[PDB]
Amino acid sequence: ASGGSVIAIKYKGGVLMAADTLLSYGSLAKWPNIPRIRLLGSHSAVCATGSYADFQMMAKQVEDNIERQKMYHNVDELSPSEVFSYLHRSIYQKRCDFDPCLCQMVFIGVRDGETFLAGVDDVGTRWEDDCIATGYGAYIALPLLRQALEKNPDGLSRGEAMRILTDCLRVLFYRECRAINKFQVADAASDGVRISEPFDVETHWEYEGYCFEKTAII
Amino acid sequence: SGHDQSTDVFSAEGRVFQVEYAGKAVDNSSTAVAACCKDGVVVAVEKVHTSRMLEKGSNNRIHAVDRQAGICICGLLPDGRAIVSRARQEAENSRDIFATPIRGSVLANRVGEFMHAYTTHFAYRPFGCSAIIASYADDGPQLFVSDPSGTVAGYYGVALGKAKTVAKSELEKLDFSSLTCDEAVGKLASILHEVHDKQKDKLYEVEVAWVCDKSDRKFVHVPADMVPAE
């Protein structure tokens, strides 16, 4: 099994991470109604591309660590950046054992103002931006997010960023083979991460240039 | 003679003296009491401060073990910490291997089994602390006690500490069939103040925890303004 693509963007006050709700087995769309967005602790969320077993094990291993640490000792729960750091160190440690965690993850989180959005590969590479995307979203979706960021660097609004998230999800549906039209958007604001109900983006297949006579190679 | 120096020596009458000496050290610890109130459990412990500069929150004896189970260690605090860490290793495994919260009775059985592997060998000494395990799993509220002997037993209301008899004579007269935790956090807390002598230790304070439906079946410390003043 293997997930699809993930995209994520920071707006004025929070983060948005969108992902399709589908698990494929090679070319076969196996399960179209499973949730791929997990959320860790009470401030952060994660979503992985590629093999599902590895993401399922790694997210479980980093969700056991958060709750135990907070329950055993009287300490504050880990900030987004620190649970992401632990995620990255564990992925790198699994890679040194030739036991790779073959999934590119996108990690979002918000804690009282300091909003955090990072991404980690499976070889151990980690980065942070104002827009992340894995799978094929790094090629198709990411350029659109980058232009929508730079056309107004002051900071997008929540609706003005949800718009472009829909506009990139549409193209990802058009141009990615192993994808379906039923996505989910996890929105992380100061209160905390909140996953939305599945929704569908509308499409357009009625260009005149697609008519039977024109596309014909007689 | 020498028949009471190691844990692997039966007395002439088949008694393991070292474990009786261990239990003697628990008989001299701070008071604790607990009630299984058919919709939750309430544990309440006496903390005897030896110093009036101690920050509130120090030497807390009630430790969370899983989401729903907690342990109050009446006796030697360092040894209770070892038992709490072992119970935490046992509860995380069932949440890891078996994808399920550990049932209260199983946790009590394992904690007793671990407390007893220290009273068979010649190279260890028995734990100097008695544990009170309060759990609320999918099998109802459960209150167990483990003695340094390694013997577990489930109760409705249990008393431990130096003042153990008179503080137990208080629990006989509660109902425990209609008793609700919301009033038990008052009842047991008042019992400890009644049984506590104050011309020995000038500094003392009561710390109480509970797990019932109101706390989403989670073992937490009582809200501060829920314990009667004295």
Domain boundary assignment for chain B: 1-230
CA distance B64 to chain A (A): 6
| Cα angle A143-A147-A150, degrees, rounded to a multiple of 5 | 140
Rounded to the nearest angstrom, the minimum Cα separation between B62 and chain A is 11
Mutation site for B-interface testing, chosen from A58, A65, A68, A75 by largest number of B Cβ within 10 Å = A68
Tell me, what DSSP letter sits at residue B181?
A: H
Are residues B88 and A64, on separate chains, in Cβ contact within 8 Å?
A: no
User: Strands B32-36 and B40-47: what pairing?
Assistant: antiparallel
Question: Amino acid identity of B135?
Answer: S
Spatial distance between the Cα atoms of B15 and B106, rounded to a whole number of angstroms = 28
The number of distinct structural domains making up chain A is 1
* Chain A residues whose beta carbon lies within 8 Å of the beta carbon of residue B88: 68, 72
Token pair listed for B78: 């360092």
Element (H, E) at B154: strand B152-154
The radius of gyration computed from the CA coordinates of chain A, to the nearest angstrom, equals 18
- Report how far apart, in Å, the C-alpha atoms of A90 and of each of A97, B16, B50 are: 11, 48, 44
Name beta bridge partners: A131: A9
B189 membership: H or E segment, kind and range: helix B181-195
Distance CA B36, CA B154 (A): 9
Do B67 and A71 count as a contact with CB atoms less than 8 A apart? yes
Q: Is A72 on the interface with B (CB under 8 A)?
A: yes
- Domain residues for the domain of A160 are 1-218
What is the rounded distance in angstroms from the CA atom of residue A49 to the CA atom of residue A65? 22
Cα torsion angle, B187, B188, B194, B198, sign: negative
Q: Choose from A67, A72, A73, A75 for mutation: most chain B CBs within 10 A.
A: A72
Q: Are B136 and B126 in contact (CB under 8 A)?
A: no
Angle at B162 between CA B167 and CA B165, to 5 degrees: 35
Closest CA to A201 of A217, A188, A213, A184: A184
Is residue A116 within 8 A of residue A80, CB to CB? The reply is: yes
Amino acid making up residue B40: G
Task: Reduce the DSSP state of residue B50 to 3 states and report it.
Answer: coil
Interface check for B67 against chain A (CB to CB < 8 A): the answer is yes
Q: Please check whether residue B206 is in contact with residue B44, taking contact to mean a CB–CB distance below 8 angstroms.
A: yes
Distances from the Cα of B97 to the Cα of A169, B40, B92, B110, B168, angstroms: 38, 27, 8, 16, 40
Question: CA of A193, closest CA in chain B: separation in Å?
Answer: 21
CB distance A40 to A187 below 8 Å:
no
For residue A65, give how far its alpha carbon lies from the nearest alpha carbon of chain B (Å).
10
Whether residue A91 contacts residue A122, with contact meaning beta carbons closer than 8 Å, is answered with: yes
Q: Is-contact B52 B38, C-beta < 8 A? A: no
CA distance B95 to B65: 12
Tell me the three-class secondary structure of chain A, residue by residue. Answer: CECCCEEEEEECCEEEEEEECCEEECCEEEECCCCCCEEECCCEEEEEEEEHHHHHHHHHHHHHHHHHHHHHCCCCCCCHHHHHHHHHHHHHHHHHCCCCCCEEEEEEEEECCEEEEEEECCCCCEEECCEEECHHHHCCHHHHHHHHHHCCCCCCCHHHHHHHHHHHHHHHHHHCCCCCCCEEEEEECCCCEEECCCECCCCCCCCHHHCCCCCCCC
- Compute the distance between CA of residue B214 and CA of residue B184 in angstroms, rounded to an integer: 14
